[PDB]
Request: fold
Amino acid sequence: MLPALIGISGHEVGAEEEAAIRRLQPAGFILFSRNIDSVEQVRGLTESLRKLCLHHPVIAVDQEGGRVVRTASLGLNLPSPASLARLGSVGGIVELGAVTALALRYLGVNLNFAPVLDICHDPSAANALPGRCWGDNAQDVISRGGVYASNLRRGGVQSCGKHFPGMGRALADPHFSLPVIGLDERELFKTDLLPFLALCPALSSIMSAHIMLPQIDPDYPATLSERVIRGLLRDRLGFRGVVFTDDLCMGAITTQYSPDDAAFLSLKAGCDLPLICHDPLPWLDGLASRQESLNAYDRWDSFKRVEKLSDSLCFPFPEKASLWDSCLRRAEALCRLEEDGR
Ligand SMILES: CC(=O)N[C@@H]1[C@@H](O)[C@H](O)[C@@H](CO)O[C@@H]1O
Ligand SMILES: [Cl-]
Ligand SMILES: [Cl-]
Ligand SMILES: [Cl-]
Ligand SMILES: [Cl-]
Ligand SMILES: [Mg+2]
Ligand SMILES: [Mg+2]
Reply:
């Protein structure tokens, strides 16, 4: 099993993709809007991915709500976490988790890259993608994100807390290529790290961001720092689940490493499944070759975490049109609920 998630180009697995999947057996896949056109087409895509894999593959998506939604082509739209936080409706947060779980499960998706546990500390911090945050302090994020994650998981879809160690504090720095969190660890655990610690039982997994924590490691970002992952995340925070990386194919991280080396480095640091989201095929062979250069016991620990995740993955619902109509009906009603509450 290749320890990574890889993207898929289109509505069906291509020839080159299918070849690499048979040969390398990736732990799973991440889907985007380019993979989602109709219910039948999606269920066929996820069926293909499951059949091409000997193990039960992770099939993941960023179905957050608002401006991060991958199902527009299905007519399935969802409100943003920030809008449900403003609405103040507790039932609305439950329903976002429940409806997301129901729909993703009908499509054969088994993991959602949510909740976002970043804190939106100030309405001044500019965010290119607005609305992703559940609140402006750790306690509100824990309360709203926890209700979300609970009901996502209650519906059989695994959750992922992101982005460790807390993107709300990350600032651009002239002396660094990647964003920087200069906070002391003790203040981090009182604030941006607190949602990850408080919600561990509700988080199937956690995704690490490409952020510099220079007081802990001045040379490698969190995703590639053994001190941040094995020290801060595994030891002090105590998280025992699967650790994903931020995408290795886009962003400032690509100006520092190529995706195959970064994937290896993240496994060395203690992550379990780096994300190779866009054009993955050129990088998979170099990763699979460098794999046996890892400590065999570390590889065994990481495989047991991935195996535990895989064993919790749920299978798609049997075909039933009225079930999918309810997904559309409840999603539409959830959007109108937020719209009417403004
Ligand atoms: C900071 C940020 O937006 N990171 C995103 C993450 O949210 C997403 O889940 C992943 C897969 O699409 O790609 C990027 O790493
Ligand atoms: Cl292909
Ligand atoms: Cl919003
Ligand atoms: Cl806080
Ligand atoms: Cl844990
Ligand atoms: Mg369509
Ligand atoms: Mg299978």
